[PDB]
Amino acid sequence: TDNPDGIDYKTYDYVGVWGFSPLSNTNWFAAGSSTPGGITDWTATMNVNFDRIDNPSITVQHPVQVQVTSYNNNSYRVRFNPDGPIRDVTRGPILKQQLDWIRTQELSEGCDPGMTFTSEGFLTFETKDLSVIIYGNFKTRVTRKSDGKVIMENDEVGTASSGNKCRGLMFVDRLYGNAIASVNKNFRNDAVKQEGFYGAGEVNCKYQDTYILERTGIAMTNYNYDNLNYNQWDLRPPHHDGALNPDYYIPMYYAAPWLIVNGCAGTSEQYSYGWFMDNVSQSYMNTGDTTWNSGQEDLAYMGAQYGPFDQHFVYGAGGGMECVVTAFSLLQGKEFENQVLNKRSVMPPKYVFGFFQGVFGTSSLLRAHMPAGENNISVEEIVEGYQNNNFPFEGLAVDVDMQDNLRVFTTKGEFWTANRVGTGGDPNNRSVFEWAHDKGLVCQTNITCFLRNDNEGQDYEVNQTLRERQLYTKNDSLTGTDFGMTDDGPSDAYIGHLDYGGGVECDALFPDWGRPDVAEWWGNNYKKLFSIGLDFVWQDMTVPAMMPHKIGDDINVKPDGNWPNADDPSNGQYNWKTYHPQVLVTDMRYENHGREPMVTQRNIHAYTLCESTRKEGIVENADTLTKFRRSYIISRGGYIGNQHFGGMWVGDNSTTSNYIQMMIANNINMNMSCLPLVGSDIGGFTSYDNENQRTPCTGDLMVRYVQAGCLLPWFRNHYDRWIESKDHGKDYQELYMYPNEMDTLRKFVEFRYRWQEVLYTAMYQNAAFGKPIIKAASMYNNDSNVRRAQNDHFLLGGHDGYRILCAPVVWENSTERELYLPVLTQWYKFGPDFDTKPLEGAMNGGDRIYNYPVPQSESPIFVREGAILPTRYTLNGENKSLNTYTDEDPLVFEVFPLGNNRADGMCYLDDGGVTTNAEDNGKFSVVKVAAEQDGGTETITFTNDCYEYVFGGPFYVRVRGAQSPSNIHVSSGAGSQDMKVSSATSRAALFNDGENGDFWVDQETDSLWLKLPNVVLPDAVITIT
């Protein structure tokens, strides 16, 4: 039954950060006083008296829960509901079952937060490193035990004569609105603390000409949006004139109400903590922005258009911002389901780390069946171009082009080898996906939840069963709004419009996700694609991203590009490029709880789509998958918690230097919002040349794009292609189309391929421990200079996740950059060339190099001392896809020069996702290695933490800076032997002809290679004298 809490919904339209202003006080309640309401488990209740700040005699009472969530990881939670009872969400990143599991574990270890009400009514409690006090009006001080330092405090506002009111807890009188807010003191301007705020999902922020990482001193909003180019005109500030650049006040595709605050950076007294307002209505994060009077320099807040109020403060276990990220990912963890592998996120197939190509505007599988049309291309041509030119190349992102007339889950004849649709498994009529398997590729295909509704009487089973089973969103509201209607019906359906431009368009119905039965119906449609050879999913238009529309207009008519605007507001008539926000949706937050207008829950839609694809598509129907039983999702939208469904790409970027800068910042920020497998379209998706949209990306920009993206988790070149029947886009963008740059393009893809295990093992570090793959420079501790370098330096890889430094050039036509090397370690220049020549001399960390040289053919990438990295090569020397590697393609442990006479490395091994036995049954291995120099003796030790996956071929150790040994001894469960010099005199010969127990003195790269049998991998001691 609709609106069960009896809310009066006051706001439906978007409200920019210019119109959200808690610090203006008027009509806001804040916390005035309280009394104790008891403690159950680790949850204290305070009965709080809220007073109206501009009239403190107007008062209301609500219960406020304060809960310790983790003692060891120093986290706690504050929640209340000004609109009804406090309720646990049944879907979302934070679930009570996980909180319960964490509390049960810590209790069994004797953790005691000692939560107590003092006799004065104040609440006090401790965690491992912290001590908290909450006074009568909710004024809060969080103190660090070791030094006494106050690391966080909430904000109070004075009144004329009625006492101080605490702005830590705020909500708008329900006579006037529905918003909520929470305000902290912000020490950004403090000379010593110099607080900086980080995180926030996909927000872009310009400073002068450059896009930057930090999110200090700015007003932001989470409001999932079809935001092509990151600067959609309807998102402009009131009365904005001239061009709109992407910038901090524009919402993006991923909803991330999450910041990590970092102060006293680089000193022994650094502190960090993360702040999450777990709300799925439009939310706001202001880190001290005066613009529009939205906030105040010395305060920070989070808020949202709708309740309930639920926020988490996360300080982490160890020192540094990375520890904040690992603790956040624990709160969202699946330890409560006893995951043997997928604890903090879900492991992809190895092939997800390959190089992919998407094209929007292919018109067939084969050249033989391609319809004639200016600039038409076949999938076949694309594969040829990469394969004939020896690119490492994983396969394809196959767009809505392959579908029958935009009906999702269909294909058309042109995308089969015999030019007609079959049901799969016919060797004389292969699907695009079957044909791609025979080329050694895998594919994703674009799926959205628009179910085409205008079918001209033709049969489309997906839409028909959605109808028949009453599973679509209805056209109901509390406002009597008329969302529109077509001749197709049904008469009570919400009907939207999908618009790809250039006439590529249709009417659609949508699944009402919170209804029981919907998630299962949806997952089952994927059988129709899995059984014809599809490997993984590309999840698009997820807001869901509807054609812009105004109430009263026909379903297929959009308003003037300029509307709405300040002089002519939406006034409850614009759809804000998704559902008209008054539509009653079955509640996605709370099961079996009724319907609410979509305005209350916008930012949960993408998350729920992905969830349903993951559980009911990929997992439930895993039997219908052909070549790889493990699969994955790469989604355009979502909410905090998406890492448990798959990874992300940052939608529709463009082809300029600024988009490279944004790609890098987005990747780092998304990693710290616990979404690690993320990327942006390499080369930019949209056209960029205003005098002729068809102009391709320049050679030099593509090189820089590829260089910047090559060690980022998701690596796909994808673009809008101009073709006769879809006349927007660029002519081409494929790497093989760049003859002058081909050699460079190719060698950075090879470089990535060699480090496939670095990426895959970082991914395991994330699934298991929650460590971000990509590290912000400021995650590197005891360094006072990283913060300056942080826009375009990042780190990754190796046993701790900090063994590789990247500082890619972020400007076209530029052959130098300012380089900063983190201090108290030594660095070695590396990159695609260094595989086949010696290292250069050590570079001293803490060095700043102005105008450091960077030819187009190079990019700045450094390997830290003490690193041992797993590295892969093809046995034959040809470039192949990841998914066609076997254990006979060499695994090689490269030992870089030692740090303090030591080096360390880790490697995760499984079958790559051929089966799901690694995550279902524990079938994986984790090998560690160490090297120690002690006088004239070097010892290299291999150990395992589990060895449940048997690596099937020989493996190597490549020691850099070593030459001829006097003797090498290997000890291992399988007894022990001395090694002998190989008869092989080259690397290809050692790989193919060399015997197990052979070593090779590689003078050309100044390396010693040792070849070892597979049985000594899990446990060995190697003594080099």
Ligand X SMILES: *[C@@H]1O[C@@](F)(CO)[C@@H](O)[C@H](O)[C@H]1O
**Which residues contact ligand X by CB under 6 A?**
360, 399-400, 446, 500, 540-541, 636, 651-652, 685, 718
Q: Strand 891-895 relative to strand 955-960: parallel, antiparallel, unpaired? A: parallel
CB of 450 to ligand X, least distance (A): 11
| Cα–Cα dist 566/574, whole Å | 13
- In SS3 terms, 128-162 reads as CCEEEEECCCCCEEEEECCCCCEEEEECEECCCCC
CB of 500 to ligand X, least distance (A): 5
| Cα–Cα dist 710/687, whole Å | 22
Q: Which is nearer to ligand X, 362 or 417 (CB)?
A: 362
Yes or no: say if 877 and 835 are a contact pair by the CB < 8 Å rule.
Answer: no
CB of 652 to ligand X, least distance (A): 5
Q: Which is nearer to ligand X, 234 or 540 (CB)?
A: 540
CB of 633 to ligand X, least distance (A): 14
User: The tokens of 629 are what?
Assistant: 């039983």
Q: Which is nearer to ligand X, 477 or 654 (CB)?
A: 654
In the block, tokens 């439009």 appear at 282
| Cα–Cα dist 634/671, whole Å | 15
CB of 347 to ligand X, least distance (A): 25
Q: Which is nearer to ligand X, 277 or 543 (CB)?
A: 543
Q: Which is nearer to ligand X, 682 or 806 (CB)?
A: 682
- DSSP-assigned letters across all residues of 483-511: ----TT--TTB--EEEE-STT-EEEEE-B
Q: Which is nearer to ligand X, 719 or 1000 (CB)?
A: 719
Q: Which is nearer to ligand X, 680 or 917 (CB)?
A: 680
Yes or no: say if 4 and 593 are a contact pair by the CB < 8 Å rule.
Answer: yes
| Cα–Cα dist 390/519, whole Å | 42
Q: What's the DSSP call for residue 723?
A: B
Q: Minimal CA–CA distance to 457: which of 486, 412, 488?
A: 488
How long, in residues, is the chain? 1025
Q: Which is nearer to ligand X, 315 or 360 (CB)?
A: 360
Burial bucket for residue 963 (CB in 10 Å: 0-12, 13-18, 19+):
exposed
Q: What's the DSSP call for residue 200?
A: -
- DSSP-assigned letters across all residues of 663-718: HHHHHHHHHHTT--SEE--TT-SS---TT-TTPPPPHHHHHHHHHHHTTSS-EEEE
Q: What's the DSSP call for residue 613?
A: I
CB of 635 to ligand X, least distance (A): 11
Q: What's the DSSP call for residue 779?
A: G
In the block, tokens 């450094």 appear at 862
- In SS3 terms, 175-195 reads as CCCCCEEEEEECCCCCCCCCC
Q: What is the largest CA-CA distance in the chain?
A: 93
Q: Which is nearer to ligand X, 20 or 649 (CB)?
A: 649
**Which residues neighbour 410 within 8 Å (Cβ) at sequence distance 6 or greater?**
403, 404, 460, 528
In the block, tokens 């698009």 appear at 540
User: The tokens of 402 are what?
Assistant: 């392959």
Yes or no: say if 217 and 294 are a contact pair by the CB < 8 Å rule.
Answer: no
CB of 399 to ligand X, least distance (A): 5
Q: What's the DSSP call for residue 618?
A: I
Handedness of CA 417, 419, 423, 429 (dihedral sign): negative
Q: Which helix (H) or strand (E) holds 101?
A: helix 96-108
CB of 226 to ligand X, least distance (A): 9
CB of 436 to ligand X, least distance (A): 18
Q: Which is nearer to ligand X, 446 or 825 (CB)?
A: 446
Q: Strand 633-635 relative to strand 536-539: parallel, antiparallel, unpaired? A: parallel
Q: Which is nearer to ligand X, 157 or 228 (CB)?
A: 228
In the block, tokens 């919907």 appear at 518
CB of 647 to ligand X, least distance (A): 15
CB of 681 to ligand X, least distance (A): 7
Q: Which is nearer to ligand X, 93 or 637 (CB)?
A: 637
User: The tokens of 691 are what?
Assistant: 């005098």
| Cα–Cα dist 213/620, whole Å | 39
Q: Which is nearer to ligand X, 138 or 685 (CB)?
A: 685
Q: Which is nearer to ligand X, 633 or 796 (CB)?
A: 633
| Cα–Cα dist 1010/962, whole Å | 11
CB of 353 to ligand X, least distance (A): 19
Q: Which is nearer to ligand X, 718 or 771 (CB)?
A: 718
Calculate the alpha carbon distances from 520 to 8, 52, 809 in Å.
Answer: 33, 47, 47
CB of 435 to ligand X, least distance (A): 21
Q: Which is nearer to ligand X, 397 or 990 (CB)?
A: 397
Q: Minimal CA–CA distance to 869: which of 711, 654, 680?
A: 711
CA 299 to chain centroid, in Å, comes to 28
CB of 335 to ligand X, least distance (A): 34
CB of 397 to ligand X, least distance (A): 8
CB of 995 to ligand X, least distance (A): 50
